[PDB]
Amino acid sequence: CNELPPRRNTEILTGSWSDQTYPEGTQAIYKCRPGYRSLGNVIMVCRKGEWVALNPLRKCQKRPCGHPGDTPFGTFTLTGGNVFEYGVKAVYTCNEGYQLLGEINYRECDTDGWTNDIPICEVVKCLPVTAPENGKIVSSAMEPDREYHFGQAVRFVCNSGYKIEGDEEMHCSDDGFWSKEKPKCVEISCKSPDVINGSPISQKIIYKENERFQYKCNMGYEYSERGDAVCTESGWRPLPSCEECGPPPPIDNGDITSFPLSVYAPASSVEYQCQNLYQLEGNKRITCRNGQWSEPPKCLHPCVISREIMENYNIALRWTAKQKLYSRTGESVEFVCKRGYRLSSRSHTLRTTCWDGKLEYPTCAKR
């Protein structure tokens, strides 16, 4: 032959090859280029006037890379082929809820082996959550402010006297953010109920916890089981149901003789009554004149005569009915010195009159 053996596409030369023309029978050994495999060396031979192939069957095939290996919480797919040969690319993808750590997501079968390392999938994580004001976190699993991961659910429960405001439960969602917003704990409060076929008895509109709401039913309707509602963190339990000038001012030691109502309008009137033995001063009936109530009366204070105070003054009741005696405003009480006592220096009378809770006790200073 009058040349060198042609440089094949998948083979390489091994000899020096410095001469120009080569005699007959010379064997040209072709080495298997990197990333290829064969049973032996592919040998070429020059005869007549061309470089023939002594081993037509022996050929260099693509080198087999091993199984690229599966990573936890992730699958892979093959690119540019269907066999683990030299020149393919195994692209990895993490499962739902798992994010890739690093920047290399492929493995390329090269002449030496699989390029880079097997990718690693980490579970996405949500920011830690703090306990809301006037509330706690009953759920989760221990550890104050530990980073939650995909899936874990969190529940919120307020303390006593507070009700929740917002979504009750949540969970670490797919994008590493919580599924719902952080709620709030507001003091338990209730509005005035709109009772159907009824009218409210009470005056107050805003209610706190465990406060009861009294109501009456319109004519033709009656109470459905219960006759009142209670303010709870969930609302009015049970719910009110009927099935088929302002209030007068308060006075000390007394009330009105009728059930109070909400509005009176001009020309209305109410009567007052004092507690037992208390004495009333003023007009016993008040009247609404031009959106204002007339002057309500007052209850004068009666005097209580205790044996404890009479013993200190060495005095006793003349007509012994106890040990204790009450005297209304204006009533007079007659005392006598105990046996062996005299009217004392700072006394003048044994008969004194009670005036709005003030009674002058006589003293006896022992003769």
Partner: protein, 912 residues
């Protein structure tokens, strides 16, 4: 090599998962007759077996469906089955088997199999030479290739075997891992068991437990241990007293009838019964349907009581009778406790309250009964004339505070009146004598929070035996009094005094009903119903337990809560340390410190149930040109069962030495009767590729050794002959077995290794550095002995040769220190050079002769008092001619080179 795939181009199979393909796919394709087909591409693993694929679908409209298993077998024509045990013991010589399978129909295969070298193992495979064998596997057949290895270091180590066939493009590789385990036996010691209770056993609310480090006296050298700190919570149910049985209340359901007083006497048991069964939730045993009628009766009683409501919003036994204070107050009481059951009119309740304040309350503040009730048995403890003012005030006051939340909006004088009543009870509370009055006034004042100081003290000291407020008279008065006191203790939150009171009440077995039970029926069930309400279901558990290890930078904390009290909280530490545990909070727990380690074993580790002796001897006589082959030896195997009786059917698993095969005639003679059996499959196999053998025994004696023997011929020749092995066991248990090795040279078939304590190094490398002294120059000697690796270069004289059964010792005198390293040996001192017996003939070291020896620092073996040298693969050993020998012309080259070597090393040394 010709016509075979090179070793470096074979990628061994390594993916052998027991389970895989844990994937999720959705069927989104356009349905065809309701079925949507999805073609899914999968990558098979390296295992050669059958996979069972199970499918489960979840549809919005169809639900869950578990498909039938779909089996997919994966196979090859030619493959390696590398049979590895789960674990092996460090430094113990074991044999593994690689079984080569050829499943081609009509093509035999010439195969070359190689065991890759691994520094963590000891085998004939080294870094320098390979371990190959060329076998022929007939079609539709298999062949077993034994490899003998010795695990050197613990942990997850790797075994890799490759194979390639001649004249074909067919290769396979297997790379598996096994666990190497310390020699000792798995042990654990219970270091500490401590009870955690900060509120009970701790100082200032914190409890510190000091844990001592574990004993670890019998710990196997060079083995690790793990100490576990196990925290758990102790949940404690707090013993709520048992509620009164529902059957014992069947009689309290009474139809109310009569007049102003007889109606309330019949209404009392029913109202309080529903109130109790409602709270204790016992309508299940009583009868759910019955509760409806029970309500109608309460309504009935209420409606009938409205008929006696005088226009003054008061109440009396009869419409003409003067209004009674106590009766009106009691109607308020009952009606206030029944608002949660039926429809109670506010005007009725609040009107009665406004009446009592304005008409029967004096200035001082005390209630007066101006018309005593006609039934004096419905008032209970108030009959006892003493301290009527204090008692009646307390009664009426309690009815007011119970109807506060309902009649505080309508009645405006209520708070002031409650306050006035409270003043009188406060002022003359300490001058009480009757236990009953102290009890009823105590609950009237505890509702306001005005029962403190000496008053609270008198309330507590008036209770005889700390569990009952008892006063001479009827027992019903005492039951009422103790009920009031229990309601007061439930108001004062004094749960330390409540259990004794409640227990005494339940022991009375008083279920209400009867002549004059009114007060005693209402009060005892109101107090018990409130007791089951305030009763708190479990003792609070909230433990904060913080560990403190010296080897940890921060603090490991654990929050033991009630909802997760039983969760075992484990924290592991590899160092055997003493540490401090600090617990704080309410509740109880348990701490268990348990340290796992490796303990030396007195008891025999191998051959516990069988004795096995294996001998290999040169066979005598020998004939001429028949037989089977040349070089013949005799294998003798003697076994005895270590039991009380004979062993049953047993197995002899014999692996040949590389190049040997049993004699057919001897096997046919053993197989005939004599309680032995060798299958025809074995007897039919040719002389070639019969390197494994199984002799079946019908029984083996326990009294003495049962011995057999047969001749083995060498058909193949190899430079390195691998030891064969024999493994005896009983058919019913493979674990209780014994394995012995045989090698004609090497006694006890063991490979060459140097062991001390528990660290063994391989000694199956080249005997020394063999080269051809002509090819060696002065530069060659200078370049090698100047390498940084070479630690010592000595001119020595062999003083004495101590021959031993395992390793030969060469006592050398350091004549000259050409280069010194770690060992600071002086001229004149002696050092011992150790070497394997296989090398004794190859070294030919004679006494009174001299040698140039240099070696690595890795060839040291001992401790400074007895520091010895190992003649390894990198140990230069050249004979040094004597001065009279250097005058000769044959030794001229070596003498000139050696003299120059010494001079250059001494004067110039290594350039660097």
């Amino acid at each position: 090599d010709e016509d075979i795939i090179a070793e470096e181009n074979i990628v061994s199979r390594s993916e052998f998962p027991e389970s895989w393909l844990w994937n999720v796919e959705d069927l989104k394709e356009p349905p065809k007759n309701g079925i949507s087909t999805k073609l899914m591409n999968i990558f098979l693993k390296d295992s050669i077996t059958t996979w069972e694929i199970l499918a489960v679908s979840m549809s919005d409209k169809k639900g869950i469906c578990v498909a039938d298993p779909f089996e997919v077998t994966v196979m090859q024509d030619f493959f390696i089955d590398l049979r590895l045990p789960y674990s092996v013991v460090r430094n113990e010589q074991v044999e593994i088997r690689a079984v080569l399978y050829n499943y081609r129909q009509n093509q035999e295969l010439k195969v070359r199999v190689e065991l890759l070298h691994n520094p963590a193992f000891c085998s004939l495979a080294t870094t320098k030479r390979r371990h190959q064998q060329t076998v022929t596997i007939p079609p539709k057949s298999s062949l077993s290739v034994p490899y003998v290895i010795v695990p050197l270091k613990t942990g997850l180590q790797e075994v890799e075997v490759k194979a390639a066939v001649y004249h074909h493009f067919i290769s396979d590789g297997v790379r598996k891992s096994l666990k190497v385990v310390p020699e000792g036996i798995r042990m654990n010691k219970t270091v500490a068991v401590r009870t955690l209770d900060p509120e009970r056993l701790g100082r200032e609310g914190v409890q510190k437990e000091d844990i001592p480090p574990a004993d670890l006296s019998d710990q196997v050298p060079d083995t690790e241990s793990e100490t576990r700190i196990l925290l758990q919570g102790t949940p404690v149910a707090q013993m709520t007293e048992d509620a009164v049985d529902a059957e014992r209340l069947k009689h309290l359901i009474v139809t109310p009838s009569g007049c102003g007083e007889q109606n309330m006497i019949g209404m009392t048991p029913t109202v309080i019964a529903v109130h109790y069964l409602d709270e204790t939730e016992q309508w299940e045993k009583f009868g759910l349907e019955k509760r409806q009628g029970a309500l109608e009766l309460i309504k009935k009683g209420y409606t009938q009581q409205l008929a006696f409501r005088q226009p003054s919003s008061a109440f009396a036994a009869f419409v003409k009778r003067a209004p009674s204070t106590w009766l009106t107050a009691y109607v308020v009481k009952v009606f206030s406790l029944a608002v949660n059951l039926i429809a109670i009119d506010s005007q009725v309740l609040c009107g009665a309250v406004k009446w009592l304040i304005l008409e029967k309350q004096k200035p001082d503040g005390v209630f007066q009964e101006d018309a005593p009730v006609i039934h004096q048995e419905m008032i209970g403890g108030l009959r006892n004339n003493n301290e009527k003012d204090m008692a009646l005030t307390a009664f009426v006051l309690i009815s007011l505070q119970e109807a506060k939340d309902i009649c505080e909006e309508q009645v405006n004088s209520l708070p002031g009146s409650i306050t006035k009543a409270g003043d009188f009870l406060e002022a003359n509370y300490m001058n009480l004598q009757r236990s009953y009055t102290v009890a009823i006034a105590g609950y009237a004042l505890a509702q306001m929070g005005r029962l403190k100081g000496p008053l609270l003290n008198k309330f507590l000291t008036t209770a005889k035996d700390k569990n009952r407020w008892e006063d001479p008279g009827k027992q019903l008065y005492n039951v009422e009094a103790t009920s009031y006191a229990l309601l007061a203790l439930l108001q004062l939150k004094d749960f330390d005094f409540v259990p004794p009171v409640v227990r005494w009440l339940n022991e009375q077995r008083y279920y209400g009903g009867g002549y004059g039970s009114t007060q005693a029926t209402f009060m005892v069930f109101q107090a018990l119903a409130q007791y089951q309400k305030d009763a708190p279901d479990h003792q609070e558990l909230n433990l904060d337990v913080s560990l403190q290890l010296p080897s940890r930078s921060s603090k490991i904390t654990h929050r033991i809560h009630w909802e997760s009290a039983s969760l075992l909280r484990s924290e592991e530490t590899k160092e055997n340390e003493g540490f401090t545990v600090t617990a704080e909070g309410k509740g109880q727990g348990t701490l268990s410190v348990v340290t796992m380690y490796h303990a030396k074993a007195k008891d025999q580790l191998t051959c516990n149930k069988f004795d096995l002796k294996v001998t290999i001897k040169p066979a005598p006589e020998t004939e001429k040109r028949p037989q089977d082959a040349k070089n013949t030896m005799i294998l003798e195997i003697c076994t005895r069962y270590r039991g009380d009786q004979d062993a049953t059917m047993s197995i002899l698993d014999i692996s040949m030495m590389t190049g040997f095969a049993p004699d057919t005639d001897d096997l046919k003679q053993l197989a005939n009767g004599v309680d032995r059996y060798i299958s025809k499959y074995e007897l039919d196999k040719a002389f070639s590729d019969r390197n494994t053998l199984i002799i079946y025994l019908d029984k083996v004696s326990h009294s003495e050794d049962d011995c057999l023997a047969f001749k083995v011929h060498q058909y193949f020749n190899v430079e390195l002959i691998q030891p064969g092995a024999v493994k005896v066991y009983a058919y019913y248990n493979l674990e209780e077995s014994c394995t012995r090795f045989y090698h004609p040279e090497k006694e006890d078939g063991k490979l060459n290794k140097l062991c001390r304590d528990e660290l063994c190094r391989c000694a199956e490398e080249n005997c020394f550095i063999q080269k051809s002294d002509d090819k060696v120059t002065l530069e060659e000697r200078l370049d090698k002995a100047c390498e940084p690796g070479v630690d010592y270069v000595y001119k020595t004289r062999l003083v004495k040769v101590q021959l031993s059964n395992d390793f030969d010792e060469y006592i050398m005198a350091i004549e000259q220190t050409i280069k010194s390293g770690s060992d600071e040996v002086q001229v004149g001192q002696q050092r011992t050079f150790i070497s394997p017996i296989k090398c004794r003939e190859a070294l030919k070291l004679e006494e009174k002769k001299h040698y140039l020896m240099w070696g690595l620092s890795s060839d040291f073996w001992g401790e400074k008092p007895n520091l010895s040298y190992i003649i390894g693969k990198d140990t230069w050993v050249e004979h040094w001619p004597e001065e009279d020998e250097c005058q000769d012309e044959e030794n001229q080259k070596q003498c000139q080179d050696l003299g120059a070597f010494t001079e250059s090393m001494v004067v110039f040394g290594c350039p660097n």
